[PDB]
Design a protein around this ligand. Sequence first.
Ligand SMILES: CN(CC[C@H](N)CC(=O)N[C@H]1C=C[C@H](n2ccc(N)nc2=O)O[C@@H]1C(=O)O)C(=N)N
Ligand SMILES: [Mg+2]
Ligand SMILES: [Mg+2]
Ligand SMILES: [Mg+2]
Ligand SMILES: [Mg+2]
Ligand SMILES: [Mg+2]
Ligand SMILES: [Mg+2]
Ligand SMILES: [Mg+2]
Ligand SMILES: [Mg+2]
Ligand SMILES: [Mg+2]
Ligand SMILES: [Mg+2]
Ligand SMILES: [Mg+2]
Ligand SMILES: [Mg+2]
Ligand SMILES: [Mg+2]
Ligand SMILES: [Mg+2]
Ligand SMILES: [Mg+2]
Ligand SMILES: [Mg+2]
Ligand SMILES: [Mg+2]
Ligand SMILES: [Mg+2]
Ligand SMILES: [Mg+2]
Ligand SMILES: [Mg+2]
Ligand SMILES: [Mg+2]
Ligand SMILES: [Mg+2]
Ligand SMILES: [Mg+2]
Ligand SMILES: [Mg+2]
Ligand SMILES: [Mg+2]
Ligand SMILES: [Mg+2]
Ligand SMILES: [Mg+2]
Ligand SMILES: [Mg+2]
Ligand SMILES: [Mg+2]
Ligand SMILES: [Mg+2]
Ligand SMILES: [Mg+2]
Ligand SMILES: [Mg+2]
Ligand SMILES: [Mg+2]
Ligand SMILES: [Mg+2]
Ligand SMILES: [Mg+2]
Ligand SMILES: [Mg+2]
Ligand SMILES: [Mg+2]
Ligand SMILES: [Mg+2]
Ligand SMILES: [Mg+2]
Ligand SMILES: [Mg+2]
Ligand SMILES: [Mg+2]
Ligand SMILES: [Mg+2]
Ligand SMILES: [Mg+2]
Ligand SMILES: [Mg+2]
Ligand SMILES: [Mg+2]
Ligand SMILES: [Mg+2]
Ligand SMILES: [Mg+2]
Ligand SMILES: [Mg+2]
Ligand SMILES: [Mg+2]
Ligand SMILES: [Mg+2]
Ligand SMILES: [Mg+2]
Ligand SMILES: [Mg+2]
Ligand SMILES: [Mg+2]
Ligand SMILES: [Mg+2]
Ligand SMILES: [Mg+2]
Ligand SMILES: [Mg+2]
Ligand SMILES: [Mg+2]
Ligand SMILES: [Mg+2]
Ligand SMILES: [Mg+2]
Ligand SMILES: [Mg+2]
Ligand SMILES: [Mg+2]
Ligand SMILES: [Mg+2]
Ligand SMILES: [Mg+2]
Ligand SMILES: [Mg+2]
Ligand SMILES: [Mg+2]
Ligand SMILES: [Mg+2]
Ligand SMILES: [Mg+2]
Ligand SMILES: [Mg+2]
Ligand SMILES: [Mg+2]
Ligand SMILES: [Mg+2]
Ligand SMILES: [Zn+2]
Lengths: 181, 53, 141, 84, 110
Amino acid sequence: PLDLALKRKYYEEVRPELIRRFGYQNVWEVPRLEKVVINQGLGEAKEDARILEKAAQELALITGQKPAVTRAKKSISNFKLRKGMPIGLRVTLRRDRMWIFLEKLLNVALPRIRDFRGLNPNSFDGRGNYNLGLREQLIFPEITYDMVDALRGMDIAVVTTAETDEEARALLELLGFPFRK
Amino acid sequence: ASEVRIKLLLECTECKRRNYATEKNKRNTPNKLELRKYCPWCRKHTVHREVKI
Amino acid sequence: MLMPRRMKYRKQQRGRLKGATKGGDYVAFGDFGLVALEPAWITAQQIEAARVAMVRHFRRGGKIFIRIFPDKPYTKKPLEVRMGKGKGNVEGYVAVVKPGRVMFEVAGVTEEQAMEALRIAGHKLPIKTKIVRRDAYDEAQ
Amino acid sequence: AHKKGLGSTRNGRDSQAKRLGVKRYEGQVVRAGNILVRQRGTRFKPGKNVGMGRDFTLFALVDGVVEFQDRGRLGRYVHVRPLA
Amino acid sequence: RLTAYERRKFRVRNRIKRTGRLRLSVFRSLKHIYAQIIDDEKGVTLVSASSLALKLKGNKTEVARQVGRALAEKALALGIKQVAFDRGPYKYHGRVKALAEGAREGGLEF
RNA sequence: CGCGGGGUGGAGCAGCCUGGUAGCUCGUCGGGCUCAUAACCCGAAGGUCGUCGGUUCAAAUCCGGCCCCCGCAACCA
RNA sequence: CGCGGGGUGGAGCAGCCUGGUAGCUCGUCGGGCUCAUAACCCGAAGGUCGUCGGUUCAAAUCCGGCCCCCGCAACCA
RNA sequence: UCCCCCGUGCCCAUAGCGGCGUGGAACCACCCGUUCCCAUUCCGAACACGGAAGUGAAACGCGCCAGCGCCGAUGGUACUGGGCGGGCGACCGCCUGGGAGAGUAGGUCGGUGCGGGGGA
RNA sequence: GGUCGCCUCCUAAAAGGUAACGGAGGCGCCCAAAGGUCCCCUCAGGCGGGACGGAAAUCCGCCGGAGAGCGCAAGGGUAGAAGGGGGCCUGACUGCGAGGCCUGCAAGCCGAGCAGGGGCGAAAGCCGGGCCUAGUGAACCGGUGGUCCCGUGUGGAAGG
RNA sequence: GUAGAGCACUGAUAGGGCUAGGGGGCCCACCAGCCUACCAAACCCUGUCAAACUCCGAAGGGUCCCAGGUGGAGCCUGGG
Ligand SMILES: CN(CC[C@H](N)CC(=O)N[C@H]1C=C[C@H](n2ccc(N)nc2=O)O[C@@H]1C(=O)O)C(=N)N
Ligand SMILES: [Mg+2]
Ligand SMILES: [Mg+2]
Ligand SMILES: [Mg+2]
Ligand SMILES: [Mg+2]
Ligand SMILES: [Mg+2]
Ligand SMILES: [Mg+2]
Ligand SMILES: [Mg+2]
Ligand SMILES: [Mg+2]
Ligand SMILES: [Mg+2]
Ligand SMILES: [Mg+2]
Ligand SMILES: [Mg+2]
Ligand SMILES: [Mg+2]
Ligand SMILES: [Mg+2]
Ligand SMILES: [Mg+2]
Ligand SMILES: [Mg+2]
Ligand SMILES: [Mg+2]
Ligand SMILES: [Mg+2]
Ligand SMILES: [Mg+2]
Ligand SMILES: [Mg+2]
Ligand SMILES: [Mg+2]
Ligand SMILES: [Mg+2]
Ligand SMILES: [Mg+2]
Ligand SMILES: [Mg+2]
Ligand SMILES: [Mg+2]
Ligand SMILES: [Mg+2]
Ligand SMILES: [Mg+2]
Ligand SMILES: [Mg+2]
Ligand SMILES: [Mg+2]
Ligand SMILES: [Mg+2]
Ligand SMILES: [Mg+2]
Ligand SMILES: [Mg+2]
Ligand SMILES: [Mg+2]
Ligand SMILES: [Mg+2]
Ligand SMILES: [Mg+2]
Ligand SMILES: [Mg+2]
Ligand SMILES: [Mg+2]
Ligand SMILES: [Mg+2]
Ligand SMILES: [Mg+2]
Ligand SMILES: [Mg+2]
Ligand SMILES: [Mg+2]
Ligand SMILES: [Mg+2]
Ligand SMILES: [Mg+2]
Ligand SMILES: [Mg+2]
Ligand SMILES: [Mg+2]
Ligand SMILES: [Mg+2]
Ligand SMILES: [Mg+2]
Ligand SMILES: [Mg+2]
Ligand SMILES: [Mg+2]
Ligand SMILES: [Mg+2]
Ligand SMILES: [Mg+2]
Ligand SMILES: [Mg+2]
Ligand SMILES: [Mg+2]
Ligand SMILES: [Mg+2]
Ligand SMILES: [Mg+2]
Ligand SMILES: [Mg+2]
Ligand SMILES: [Mg+2]
Ligand SMILES: [Mg+2]
Ligand SMILES: [Mg+2]
Ligand SMILES: [Mg+2]
Ligand SMILES: [Mg+2]
Ligand SMILES: [Mg+2]
Ligand SMILES: [Mg+2]
Ligand SMILES: [Mg+2]
Ligand SMILES: [Mg+2]
Ligand SMILES: [Mg+2]
Ligand SMILES: [Mg+2]
Ligand SMILES: [Mg+2]
Ligand SMILES: [Mg+2]
Ligand SMILES: [Mg+2]
Ligand SMILES: [Mg+2]
Ligand SMILES: [Zn+2]
């Protein structure tokens, strides 16, 4: 709905340096970010933690959306889990909550991670787009020591029109992402 | 159908007389099986509840 | 001994052996071969005695191809019991050969060294047999 | 002189006959109500004027001949085509 | 493999094509909205009001409303009455919805 | 082969019925007392449970094939 | 199904015909003693007194009975 | 009546998998937005709605190839209703009628009926 | 010793049916949601992808027609749902039943449609329990609740 | 849905190709490189087997319609 600092960043700076490399013969063939699916993917909320909520409202006040409880695919023995047990926290940041979130990761949250050292670049899938994992949560700007209780890393997935892995590299690299080498 | 699964008849709470015939697990729903149903001696739907068969 | 290493069913029915084989009536691996002239079941006992026979013929050398596998349960009632009270327990394992089916092939072996070889292995068998060499009819097949 | 430790079969059990299958045939006059096919799961599909019972029975809804149709990947059907 | 769209078509379509009644097949475009009337037993169309033929405009759901009023009169001339509304993959709300209650304005039974 | 019961830390026994649940005794290794050894006092160590399939979310436990311990039979008129 | 009685600490039970205390040995910790495993001995954590709804001025001892174990009884087409 | 298009039926993959292309004035789609109706175990993704700036990239459409899948003969054979003879047997042969499965040659990148909206 | 009723499959010879102390398995339950409806949705699995995190917890991607699922045995069926989720619900109706399936009898089984009265749905329509095929017991004797039909001269009662 | 026949599914299956982990030196990995006349999953090509396997599939057999068929035929109701 809105207009923000990375949304225009992707606008007049990124679209050209992309037609730079691959020289797209059409307005749309050019990459662009669609979905952003954050995944705390608990399982720490087994047959116990009803307090999975005070860890997922934190997920709300850092993503802006309520996260939807993903349950069990089936029942699992050594994992201590029954088909139906809550074990996931999926929030799909789509459209203009994506840019509002993605910039706040890159400019403020990404650097505040302890001993930052690039981004693992092989972790690109190939057939399409990209995603890679965390370690914590309070590194995110919205919180600190007393507000955050238990520690909880989280997964984060990009879904772009990057048909090819190479052109994905460029899209994110230019968009503000620091890589390992 | 067993110890656990008791049988039960549906009372009509307008006149207290019996009406229907079915079963119910007395474990997971130890309550009273209360369901709207029909009456020939009333020709109108009403309230019904488990009287011990 | 050539037993099925896993089994779908325990005992299995008899079934008559009408007619010629269903496949493998043309050599396909070795140079020469042994074939059925008459239908039988062949025991793993028999099969292994033919193999061991040839193997001992060209002691040290040669390669043996054997194109039938004991997949049928040869059941049998224990000693001195009357009829009924179930089916026999499975006593052996046999393979169904019909006339034409190829059983033993050899390669890396002289002419008569595979004649005498596939001769004796014929003798450890309950049936009349013919030895035939690979031919174009087999290549065209 | 005879029997010894005679093995008892664990089986020898069996089901009833279900007398299933097709009961009326194409180009066979039927009236409304008739059963055209008994089965366990639509090997045959409920055509025009052909209904299906709580066990997948297939019964005629109106009179006049039954008629079989085979729509390949879609399914085998039977309909009744009314009188004249 | 089939689409959510593709499955949902048959799902409600078949629910109706086996009612024997004249099926009124609709189509929701982002542009405008039309609908014909098909006797699937043969396969022929009975009549076909629209918004490209009637070439109207002025709010989608009010021109969805109108096209049905066309259908109503233009079908009732051919003694049509047995109406079974094929609602397509679309629901029964707003656009396609108004077409119905508009088709009802004329005298069409459904 | 027919039925019956059994197979779990080294020895002997519970545990199975009602699945997720491994205990008792001895002994064993470490330490104490003792001149020293036992006694006794302080600690710990030690079983995928016959064997294999398999049911279930999952098996000492439920189920079936086979190996083995033991108990009655295999009537021979 | 109907007559008999209670379902008390973790494991047993006296509180109880006549309500007043949120009850005693075993078990368990610490302690004096023991050479010790022990008896003795001083302090202790444990009641939502089967629950629910009551009788009052509160109840665990008085009730409607839910409950579902022990007890006896009789019937079983 | 010929053609393209949209909405659809029908034969049942010769239709399909894939790669190669081309189609936007039309019509279809993506696309614009969240105000309204409506809407998400989160998200206007989807369903919804108000739109018409962009486009034919995606999807879909028409088409091209035969790598895949698919269909696939003729000939012969196995088998067999019926009629005969043959072997201790396991089983084998002849007559007459019927006659496959595989495999071979080859075919296939669809075929159409109803209405509507464009072209001449 | 084993068996005895029921269901699935095979034997069973391409209709139905068919024996044997033939070969293999299950049933004596379960579900107020696992049911009715309306709306909506789509598997197993494999590969790449990713904090904890795994051969397999959850999230992302591309390939998948059905090998998943459908309470539990097996076969048939089945995603154009019969399977997964949500809203309202209680047709797990009362009075019937044209016509048939099976069949020695008796039982078993399918059901359009009509009437009363409701459920969901905009409506067309769907609901007389569950994807079907087991989850069972004739008659006699009695219990309980109703009805108020008989009631030993007669009004009641007893009994039926 | 049988004889046949075929592995397309359910399982068996001989070889070879290719390839997990196991096995095993090279290393002596604290771990990598592993090489394979070892075992051998999926997977591939050759070659097969199956009452309870089926992409297939006969001859036939059922059943209705229509025609021949007058036969110690057929049908309904009753006695034995
Ligand atoms: C030992 N006896 C004999 C009883 C008889 N009247 C006489 C006799 O010898 N009967 C025997 C006859 C044979 C019978 N038998 C044996 C084996 C068999 N397979 N079937 C049989 O019937 O077993 C009987 C048996 O010994 O009791 C008594 N105590 N009465
Ligand atoms: Mg380029
Ligand atoms: Mg670092
Ligand atoms: Mg004798
Ligand atoms: Mg059967
Ligand atoms: Mg035993
Ligand atoms: Mg032992
Ligand atoms: Mg003991
Ligand atoms: Mg056991
Ligand atoms: Mg245990
Ligand atoms: Mg001490
Ligand atoms: Mg065991
Ligand atoms: Mg004896
Ligand atoms: Mg007492
Ligand atoms: Mg008092
Ligand atoms: Mg001392
Ligand atoms: Mg007594
Ligand atoms: Mg009793
Ligand atoms: Mg269409
Ligand atoms: Mg293009
Ligand atoms: Mg333009
Ligand atoms: Mg392009
Ligand atoms: Mg396409
Ligand atoms: Mg064209
Ligand atoms: Mg054309
Ligand atoms: Mg053309
Ligand atoms: Mg053409
Ligand atoms: Mg060409
Ligand atoms: Mg070609
Ligand atoms: Mg070509
Ligand atoms: Mg062919
Ligand atoms: Mg004959
Ligand atoms: Mg003869
Ligand atoms: Mg021919
Ligand atoms: Mg012939
Ligand atoms: Mg024209
Ligand atoms: Mg003109
Ligand atoms: Mg006996
Ligand atoms: Mg019949
Ligand atoms: Mg019998
Ligand atoms: Mg794989
Ligand atoms: Mg992985
Ligand atoms: Mg990871
Ligand atoms: Mg990792
Ligand atoms: Mg993973
Ligand atoms: Mg099942
Ligand atoms: Mg079968
Ligand atoms: Mg199957
Ligand atoms: Mg549903
Ligand atoms: Mg649900
Ligand atoms: Mg509503
Ligand atoms: Mg009747
Ligand atoms: Mg009748
Ligand atoms: Mg009805
Ligand atoms: Mg109605
Ligand atoms: Mg059932
Ligand atoms: Mg009474
Ligand atoms: Mg009277
Ligand atoms: Mg009087
Ligand atoms: Mg009375
Ligand atoms: Mg091999
Ligand atoms: Mg191999
Ligand atoms: Mg080998
Ligand atoms: Mg290699
Ligand atoms: Mg067969
Ligand atoms: Mg064919
Ligand atoms: Mg034919
Ligand atoms: Mg006469
Ligand atoms: Mg008469
Ligand atoms: Mg008469
Ligand atoms: Mg009479
Ligand atoms: Zn009433």
